[PDB]
Design a binder for this molecule. Structure first.
Ligand SMILES: CCCCCCCCCCCCCCCCCC(=O)OC[C@H](COP(=O)([O-])OCC[N+](C)(C)C)OC(=O)CCCCCCCCCCCCCCCCC
Ligand SMILES: CCCCCCCCCCCCCCCCCC(=O)OC[C@H](COP(=O)([O-])OCC[N+](C)(C)C)OC(=O)CCCCCCCCCCCCCCCCC
Ligand SMILES: CCCCCCCCCCCCCCCCCC(=O)OC[C@H](COP(=O)(O)OCCN)OC(=O)CCCCCCCCCCCCCCCCC
Ligand SMILES: CCCCCCCCCCCCCCCCCC(=O)OC[C@H](COP(=O)(O)OCCN)OC(=O)CCCCCCCCCCCCCCCCC
Ligand SMILES: CCCCCCCCCCCCCCCCCC(=O)OC[C@H](COP(=O)(O)OCCN)OC(=O)CCCCCCCCCCCCCCCCC
Ligand SMILES: CCCCCCCCCCCCCCCCCC(=O)OC[C@H](COP(=O)(O)OCCN)OC(=O)CCCCCCCCCCCCCCCCC
Ligand SMILES: NC(=O)C1=CN([C@@H]2O[C@H](COP(=O)(O)OP(=O)(O)OC[C@H]3O[C@@H](n4cnc5c(N)ncnc54)[C@H](OP(=O)(O)O)[C@@H]3O)[C@@H](O)[C@H]2O)C=CC1
Ligand SMILES: *P(=O)(O)OCC(C)(C)[C@H](O)C(=O)NCCC(=O)NCCSC(=O)CCCCCCCCCCCCC
Ligand code: SF4
Ligand code: SF4
Lengths: 332, 60, 66, 49, 185, 115, 334, 337, 76, 39
């Protein structure tokens, strides 16, 4: 079922994988190793930058600005190499799995991520250079799609849709998961709850994600990337071809699967589009009894008529892009 | 060995907002230089029309 | 391409090849041969090129296919 | 005859020659769904008149 | 909204500034308004992009970069003797998330456990690599090949004859990818 | 909140059987009143008599229901199917999927294969 | 004269239309290659050497593409509007001086002729959009009408400030008058305003409201296919160049330099084209730099910012002329 | 109709009935299927899980047919009439061969005699050569070897050639056809069809093309239809004037025609057909058919012999002519006058 | 698709549009877009790489380049 | 300003006169062009 989560918010694959991997790990009552937690937080923020490049610059394209979209898609084209180097896919990695990550990062990856990191600040500034002070950008977004703080909570808004309204709320600050409680980052919060503040909060998260990524590169520990229990995670191919208990466990994990102790859970993470959650019900068997995905954009598109009725047709275009919808997660 | 950071760690990157005000786009020099172009242009225009009206007197 | 590069590459390869390259690659590339396929395809490398452009192929067939 | 009068003629013959080519050398296969209004793929109320 | 406990220090915004409290000069404010100043900066930033190298590669003469782990089209592989490596355990058929693999096996004429049918519906596959992950003997692999687009969907229903032919053709990369990627598996 | 759409009806329970009795008549009336309007919306080439015949048969299949809580689910479905049809959210293929334009004996069924 | 009247008229029209229609094809490739450079791309480089046959493949592809006449569309008007827009856009090239009086018509009132021809061609956009009887084309046509209620007064106001200096209304005389100084120096605010209106006049970005692709699908041209679409594209890109020529005529000295007649006449032609090509670049640079404005805001910008400033210049500028004794003689001289 | 079909050669066909994933067990070849009729027979055979070989000439005009059937069901073969091998390669795996190849007007490489006689000759000779069970050749109405209209004569001689070579031929004679993309109702609603020799007063019994594709499907299952001759005509007789009256009532347009004297129009029509590359509707013989009248030849089976009752053209005018109503009258209900 | 003028082509990109892909056994998914529209070239992958799609567009243009239009009429 | 030097940013550099030209005519000479280093 894990590749299904790659295809919900399909610009934020490894983050979708994480919320499903953290729900199963909670029902498995296992503690994934420190190197996996640092890989998942670093690729969690590489994913956040990838989403924001698609989200913010698709939104600017709708308002009429074409050039920032082209610049930012070279950067994301750069970052899908990091995906395609640790997994074998540019988009649907299937990398983050309950128990850690599928394989370990290759021996040249951390240096190339740091090399990209030394120039990504300039990328944020040149897209900052065409929109933040542009008077046509300001008059297309300032005062548009305004939602109050008390209504944003009542509308099930999360993420920038909520933080735009002045509420300090981050799921990685309030319920730390993986290695987030081991890093420093700031939380962008707007004050007017409009498309302009939401744009300023997302352009700040570019800088905060790049700040987190640097700390992960510095604090990357050694050790396994898979929980060291072959009853849960697949054994190394060497061990499976060398030892009997490794072969039996490899055979059972790929035919039956592992059994998840019975129960249910709601697990939520700060996805690039908001609180992404999953409600997983467990039989005690090897197949989930119920998997429900709580998609941030489902909760956001529902409040569309609340914030848009009374604006013009162009202002509706402005509000679709600030609300950052991907319909793989909306429809599921 | 696994893929590790270098001994002392990587050096810091640039992430803080950096949009430094350049004198090419300041509203005082642009207004002033506009006024010089606009005042010189009217100077030549006064010379031109005065000459053309005199050229018109000769043709008539 | 840019004038310093295009004239420098044009000087190296000759006018006849320059027009052949404007017909298939549409670029003006110079590099050293690295080998030949079983199909006749020719491969060149030049590390003094823009990233992901240091390796390229001269396709043997006119109706070239990847 | 004057340049203006021929100028008007040539621009009109160009508007005709381009139009005539498309009216002759292009396939013309009109059917019900090809000839419907565009509404992003769903038919809606016809209320533009 | 805000955290329970003492309210955040200085969370309340300062009182609004009046028109005559904004400490910008009229000459600057009016100059910026009429001279379109911030948008001239944006125009200039495009100019220096105009004089930067482009990012473009000339596909297909140049190809973008792919890793040893890259997942392309499927191939069945052989041992150095030409014997098929596939032994019909059916593990990949079981683990498939899209049920794209159909396998039928028997004892071969010489008593060997070998497949009689081996089909991959390439229009059902999700290209996750789970099937090559599970193989006990490195038989099913995904090639580094992505350029195999076809005229019909029948051309995308691979039988054992097509998949062995793929391994017979692509073995040098399949071996070099496994060599480069095996220690991490 | 967000506005309910044009034919949106709040979901409420039937008070008594008299309530349900009057609602079902209101729903049947509203459907057969709209059959001329369905025909030109969906370019139905059949006449409106056939459309109203089908409305009657849909109501007739729930004729013999003596449970308030089953009727109210049924009054819910018709309200949503009416709202869906009148706002032109569904299209011609959906409306024509609703018009169908089993063997009648054992021996007929036997000879052709089961049916 | 030496040869026939009809032949002289014939070859002069050809020398104007044919090189302009070639020039229109290259502005379309040049814009695609210029934005790409600003976008770290290449632009067309595979349809002809360096991509120099791209516009012709686009043109030829459409003239061989099937036309559709929608059932809900008023069809005679569905074809009449693009034909009006194309003919009346291309007519504006009949008064351009490529040298002193080197125009197909050296009319005494060629500035009013250009206002009449541009206004008539926008009416084709309005008609074609309405005729389609589809929502997005209907919304496209209404924006084009709002847009002309926005920029037409702005251009007519702006040009009247140039006529106060020139005193002529003839395109050659205005250029001849600029041998004293280019009108972009004394009329610098007017040059910015006229350029802004010209971008709005051409429905170019940031004012691409009638054909906006991110708000309407293609606006007025959404039901239009094959040759009808191509008529609207040649009209738009021919309007861009014409407005860049006119801006060069009125503010940048026109053809003024920055066998023997042929060598001299060439320098005028290059000089006009160089200044036009720079302004063509500024259009493409402008589409690449800015977001689209909102149509409510364009109307308010022209009507509460631009026009109030232009009316005050219309008062101020003749007051400077009478004060310095610089009213131009309105006789024929230059 | 059953789960077992037994063919003339005696092979059994154990069928699973419904859907495009099932087993119809029949391998058909449909020559001339990219025309107007050909899709309805191909959709009927394909959507019940039968393998259909579709011999084609132009690649892009065959493409709508593949949607009819599942993967591997509709097989395209590229053929020519004067390429006997491609004809033989196309019918030799088959238990039924439909011959729907015809053309109203002569072409620079095919006369009406060349496409009807010789084309049928090759197709039937291959049917005989590989011993194909069934051969449903589609002729025209009024087909007669003694006719003087080239269309009605040449399609009348191919009828006799087919029987002389393969006596079990099911000969099918449809009337002028109406339907979607028909050259009957869509021409009367068009604006090019302005010229005319008679006053649109020739009569015929128009038949729905949908009911003719169904009729051809039933002839495959009713084996007793072999060696027979079928005239497939509609329930009423109309003139071109009565049909054109219905079209005007439906599109709300009141079309008009220019009548010409046949000694004048016929020579011109033979020039337009010889000087234009597209189907112009005008040719010397199409003018000659224009002056002829349909006769239902008795001793010929009918729709009733398939147990089918055709519907009248009037019931179908709204469905097929609505794309041609002007916007003002488009939202109106069907005429049903 | 019907509203797209001739000549027209369809590229099916991806396992879902090819044969329904990972959602082939779903109650709401068409098992391949070629149950709906005719398809000229099929690109494999989920997702096909940017270059794989370019390879399928190069197949379609190679099919255009071998498409006989005016010589087709000359055969009929 | 919170800019790090161009000389640490792991991108292809200008050199010689074109370095002098570019530092004369850009908005920030410490901004990188985004083109990675082949070695
Ligand atoms: C130039 C001369 C053009 C006229 C040549 C005579 C026509 C001969 C072919 C007729 C049949 C065409 C056909 O069936 O095509 C099907 C299709 C359309 O046929 P259709 O029959 O579907 O069209 C339906 C519309 N009516 C009913 C009006 C006919 O044609 C095409 O797609 C293209 C046709 C040919 C166009 C070629 C390009 C035109 C531009 C040429 C530029 C100059 C070239 C100079 C050099 C020429 C070579 C030396
Ligand atoms: C009108 C011309 C105005 C002059 C100003 C523009 C000059 C350049 C435009 C003409 C381009 C020359 C054709 C060409 O590109 O050769 C490549 C073409 C090859 O076709 P190609 O378009 O596939 O080019 C392939 C090379 N790539 C893919 C890299 C772009 O050569 C020919 O086709 C032979 C010449 C036939 C056309 C001759 C008429 C051209 C128009 C009149 C001039
Ligand atoms: C200044 O002396 O150094 C060069 C300066 C940029 O360098 P900098 O050091 O940053 O300037 C700081 C000034 N406080 O750069 C400059 O000072 C040059 C400023 C421009 C001076 C020439 C102006 C040209 C004429 C203006 C034409 C109209 C301007 C407005 C047009 C746009 C309106 C849409
Ligand atoms: C938008 C459109 C409007 C834009 C406004 C921009 C500025 C417009 C105002 C222009 C005023 C400047 C015009 C030039 C002034 C001038 O002409 O001074 C020269 C003149 C006498 O000089 P003169 O003798 O002709 O030269 C020597 C010839 N042997 O001396 C005079 O004529 C008297 C000048 C005194 C008043 C000058 C005040 C302005 C300085
Ligand atoms: C020459 C060198 C330059 C060549 C290139 C020119 C630039 C090309 C750019 C593309 C075309 C122009 C795009 C225009 C975009 C500006 C715009 O339309 O925005 C509308 C804006 C709204 O203004 P509003 O809301 O009413 O007021 C508060 C605004 N925060 O309205 C505005 O923001 C005001 C825009 C002002 C434009 C007026 C023209 C300025 C010329 C000087 C006017 C002279 C009169 C003033 C005299 C000076 C007084 C001190
Ligand atoms: C260009 C080179 C010459 C073009 C082809 C000329 C050769 C030729 O055969 O022209 C005759 C052509 C025949 O047209 P045809 O298809 O046979 O008539 C049936 C349509 N009703 O009839 C025509 O004239 C086609 C129009 C051209
Ligand atoms: N439709 C009617 O009103 C009536 C029809 N009929 C007969 O019914 C049959 C089917 O009718 P309909 O579908 O409407 O007819 P169409 O003309 O639409 O189709 C005729 C078919 O014959 C093929 N064909 C024609 N000439 C040749 C040739 N020289 N070589 C190869 N193939 C050729 C065409 O292929 P391609 O498209 O590639 O050219 C096409 O598929 C025809 O035989 C027709 O004469 C008889 C009476 C009335
Ligand atoms: P009289 O005392 O005989 O009263 C008759 C009724 C019917 C009220 C019964 O006596 C009665 O009370 N029976 C129980 C209630 C009942 O019949 N059904 C519950 C009503 S809901 C229902 O029947 C829904 C039917 C389907 C939806 C509506 C029909 C239209 C469907 C779509 C039409 C075409 C669209 C394209
Ligand atoms: S898992 Fe590998 S060895 Fe086993 S049956 Fe499948 S392909 Fe053969
Ligand atoms: S990679 Fe393809 S064949 Fe292998 S398990 Fe995944 S979907 Fe099945």
């Amino acid at each position: 079922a894990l590749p299904y989560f790659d295809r919900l918010d399909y610009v934020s694959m490894m983050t979708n994988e994480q919320v499903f991997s953290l729900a199963v790990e909670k029902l498995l009552n296992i503690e994934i190793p420190p190197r996996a937690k640092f890989i998942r937080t670093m690729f969690g923020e590489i994913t956040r930058i990838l989403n924001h490049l698609m989200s913010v610059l698709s939104h600017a394209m709708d308002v009429g600005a074409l050039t920032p979209f082209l610049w930012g898609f070279e950067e994301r084209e750069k970052l899908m190499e990091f995906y395609e180097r640790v997994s074998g896919a540019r988009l649907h990695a299937a990398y983050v799995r309950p128990g850690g990550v599928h394989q370990d990062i290759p021996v040249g990856l951390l240096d190339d991520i740091y090399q990209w990191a030394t120039q990504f600040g300039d990328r944020i500034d040149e897209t900052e250079e065409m929109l933040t002070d542009n008077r046509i950008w300001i008059n297309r977004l300032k005062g548009v799609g305004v939602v109050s703080a008390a209504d944003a909570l009542n509308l099930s808004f999360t993420g920038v849709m909520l933080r735009g309204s002045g509420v300090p709320w981050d799921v990685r600050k309030s319920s730390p998961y993986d290695a987030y409680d081991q890093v420093e980052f700031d939380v962008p919060v707007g004050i007017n709850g409009d498309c302009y503040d939401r744009y300023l909060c997302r352009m700040e998260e570019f800088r905060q994600s790049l700040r987190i990524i640097h700390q992960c590169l510095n604090k990357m520990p050694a050790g396994p990337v898979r929980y060291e229990d072959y009853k849960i995670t697949p054994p190394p191919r060497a061990a499976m071809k060398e030892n009997m208990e490794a072969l039996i466990h490899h055979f059972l994990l790929f035919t039956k699967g592992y059994a998840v102790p019975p129960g249910d859970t709601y697990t939520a993470i700060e996805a690039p589009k908001g609180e992404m959650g999953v409600y997983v019900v467990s039989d005690g068997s090897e197949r989930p009894y119920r998997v429900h995905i709580r998609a941030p954009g489902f909760a956001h598109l529902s409040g569309f008529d609340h914030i848009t009725r009374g604006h013009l047709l162009a202002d509706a275009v402005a509000v679709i892009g600030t609300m950052d919808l991907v319909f793989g997660e909306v429809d599921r | 060995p696994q893929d590790m950071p270098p001994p002392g760690g990587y050096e810091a990157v640039q992430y803080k907002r950096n949009l430094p005000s350049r004198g090419l786009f300041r509203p005082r020099p642009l207004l002033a230089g506009a006024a010089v172009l606009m005042l010189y242009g009217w100077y030549k225009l006064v010379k031109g029309i005065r000459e053309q009206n005199e050229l018109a007197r000769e043709k008539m | 391409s840019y004038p310093t590069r295009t004239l420098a590459n044009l000087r190296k390869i000759g006018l006849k090849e320059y027009f052949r390259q404007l017909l298939y690659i549409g670029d003006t590339k110079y590099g050293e041969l690295v080998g030949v396929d079983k199909f006749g395809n020719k491969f060149y490398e030049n590390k003094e090129e823009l990233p992901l452009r240091t390796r390229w192929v001269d396709y043997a067939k006119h109706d070239y296919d990847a | 005859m004057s340049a203006m009068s021929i100028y008007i003629i040539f621009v009109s013959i160009i508007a005709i020659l381009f139009l005539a080519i498309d009216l002759i050398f292009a396939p013309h296969n009109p059917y019900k769904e090809k000839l419907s209004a565009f509404e992003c793929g769903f038919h809606s109320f016809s209320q533009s008149r | 909204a805000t955290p329970a406990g003492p309210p955040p220090k200085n969370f309340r915004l300062p009182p609004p500034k009046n028109w005559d409290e904004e400490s910008e000069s009229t000459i600057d404010k009016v100059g910026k308004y009429f001279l379109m100043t911030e948008m001239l900066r944006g125009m200039y930033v495009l100019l220096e992009q105009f004089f930067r190298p482009p990012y473009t590669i000339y596909y297909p003469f140049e190809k973008g970069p792919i890793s040893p782990r890259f997942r392309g089209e499927h191939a069945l592989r052989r041992y150095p003797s030409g014997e098929e490596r596939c032994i019909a355990c059916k593990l990949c058929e079981a683990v498939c998330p899209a049920q794209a693999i159909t396998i039928e096996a028997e004892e071969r004429a010489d008593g060997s456990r070998r497949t009689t049918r081996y089909d991959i519906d390439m229009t059902k596959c999700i290209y996750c690599g789970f099937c090559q992950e599970s193989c006990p003997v490195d038989a099913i692999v995904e090639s580094p090949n992505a350029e195999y687009a076809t005229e019909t969907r029948e051309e995308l229903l691979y039988n054992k004859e097509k998949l062995l032919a793929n391994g017979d053709k692509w073995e040098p990369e399949l071996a070099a990818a496994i060599r480069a990627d095996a220690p991490y598996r | 909140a967000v506005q309910p759409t044009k034919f949106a009806v709040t979901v409420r329970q039937s008070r008594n059987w008299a309530d349900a009795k009057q609602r079902v008549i209101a729903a049947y009336r509203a459907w057969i009143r709209a059959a001329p309007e369905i025909q030109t919306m969906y370019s139905i080439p059949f006449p409106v008599s056939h459309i109203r015949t089908r409305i009657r048969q849909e109501f007739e299949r729930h004729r013999y229901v003596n449970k308030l809580n089953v009727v109210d689910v049924l009054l819910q479905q018709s309200n949503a199917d009416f709202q869906e049809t009148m706002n032109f959210w569904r299209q011609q293929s959906h409306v024509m999927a609703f018009f169908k334009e089993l063997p009648s004996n054992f021996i007929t069924g036997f000879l052709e294969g089961r049916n | 004269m030496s040869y026939s009247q009809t032949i002289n008229s014939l070859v002069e029209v050809v020398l104007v239309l044919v090189p302009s229609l070639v020039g229109i094809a290259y502005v379309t490739v040049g814009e695609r290659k210029t934005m790409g450079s600003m976008q770290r791309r290449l632009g067309p480089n595979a349809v002809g050497i360096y991509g120099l046959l791209q516009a012709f493949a686009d043109a030829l592809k459409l003239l061989l593409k099937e036309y559709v006449g929608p059932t809900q569309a008023n069809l005679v008007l569905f074809f009449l509007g693009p034909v009006i827009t194309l003919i009346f856009s291309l007519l504006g090239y009949a008064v351009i001086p490529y040298g002193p009086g080197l125009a197909v018509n050296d009319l005494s009132t060629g500035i009013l002729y250009m206002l009449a021809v541009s206004s008539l061609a926008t009416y084709g956009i309005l008609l074609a959009g309405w005729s389609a009887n589809s929502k997005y084309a209907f919304l496209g046509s209404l924006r084009s009408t709002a847009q002309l209620i926005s920029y037409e007064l702005v251009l007519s106001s702006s040009i009247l400030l140039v006529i106060m200096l020139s005193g002529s209304l003839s395109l050659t005389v205005i250029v001849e008058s600029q041998r004293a100084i280019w009108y972009i120096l004394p009329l610098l605010p007017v040059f910015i305003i006229f350029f802004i209106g010209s971008v709005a006049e051409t429905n170019r970005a940031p004012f691409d409201l009638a054909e906006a692709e991110s708000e309407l699908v293609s606006g007025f041209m959404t039901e239009h296919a094959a040759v009808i679409f191509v008529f609207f594209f040649l009209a738009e890109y021919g309007s861009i160049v014409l407005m860049c020529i006119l801006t060069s005529i009125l503010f940048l000295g026109g053809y003024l330099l920055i066998n023997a007649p042929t060598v001299e006449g060439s320098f005028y032609g290059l000089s006009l084209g160089v200044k036009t090509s720079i302004l063509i670049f500024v259009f493409i640079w402008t589409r690449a730099s800015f977001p689209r404005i909102r149509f409510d805001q364009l109307m308010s910008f022209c009507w509460t910012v631009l026009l109030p400033i232009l009316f005050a210049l219309i008062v101020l500028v003749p007051c400077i002329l009478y004060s310095f004794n610089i009213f131009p003689v309105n006789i024929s001289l230059l | 109709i059953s789960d077992i079909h037994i063919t003339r050669t005696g092979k059994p066909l154990i069928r699973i009935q419904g859907g495009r994933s099932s087993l119809g067990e029949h391998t058909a070849t449909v020559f001339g299927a990219t025309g107007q009729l050909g899709r309805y027979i191909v959709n009927r055979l394909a959507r019940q899980g039968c393998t259909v070989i579709v011999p084609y000439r132009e690649e892009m005009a065959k493409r709508h047919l593949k949607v009819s059937g599942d993967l591997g069901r509709v097989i395209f073969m590229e053929f020519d009439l004067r390429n006997t091998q491609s004809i033989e390669e196309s019918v030799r795996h088959s238990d039924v061969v439909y011959n729907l190849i015809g053309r109203d007007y002569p072409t620079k490489n095919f006369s009406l005699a060349d496409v009807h006689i010789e084309g049928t000759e090759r197709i039937v000779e291959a049917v005989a050569k590989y011993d194909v069970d069934r051969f449903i050749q589609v002729s025209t109405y009024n087909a007669n070897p003694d006719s003087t209209c080239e269309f009605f004569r040449t399609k009348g001689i191919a009828e006799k050639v087919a029987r002389h070579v393969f006596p079990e031929t099911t000969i099918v004679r449809p009337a002028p056809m109406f339907g979607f993309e028909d050259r009957l109702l869509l021409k009367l609603a068009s604006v090019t069809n302005l010229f005319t020799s008679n006053h649109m007063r020739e009569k015929f019994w128009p038949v729905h093309v949908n009911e003719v594709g169904e009729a051809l499907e039933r002839m495959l299952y009713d084996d007793s239809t072999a060696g027979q001759t079928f005239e497939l005509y509609g329930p009423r007789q109309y003139s071109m004037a009565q049909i054109a009256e219905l079209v005007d009532r439906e599109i709300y347009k009141k079309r008009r025609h220019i009548n010409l004297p046949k000694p004048i129009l016929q020579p011109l029509a033979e020039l337009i057909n010889r000087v234009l590359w597209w189907d112009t509707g005008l040719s010397r013989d199409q003018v000659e058919r224009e002056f002829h009248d349909q006769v239902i030849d008795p001793t010929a089976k009918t729709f009733k012999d398939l147990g089918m009752e055709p519907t009248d053209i009037s019931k179908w005018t709204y469905h097929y002519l609505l794309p041609y109503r002007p916007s003002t009258y488009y939202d109106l209900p069907p005429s049903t006058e | 698709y019907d509203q797209m003028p001739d000549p027209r082509w369809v590229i099916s990109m991806g396992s879902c549009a090819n044969g329904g892909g990972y959602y082939h056994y779903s109650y709401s998914v068409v098992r391949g877009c070629d149950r709906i529209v005719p398809v000229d070239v099929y690109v494999p992958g989920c997702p096909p790489t940017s270059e794989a799609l370019m390879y399928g567009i190069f197949q379609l243009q190679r099919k255009m380049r071998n498409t006989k239009i005016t010589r087709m009429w000359y055969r009929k | 300003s919170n800019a790090v030097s161009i000389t640490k940013k792991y991108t292809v550099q200008s050199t010689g006169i074109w370095e002098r030209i570019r530092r004369a005519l850009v908005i920030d000479p410490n901004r990188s062009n985004g083109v990675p280093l082949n070695p």
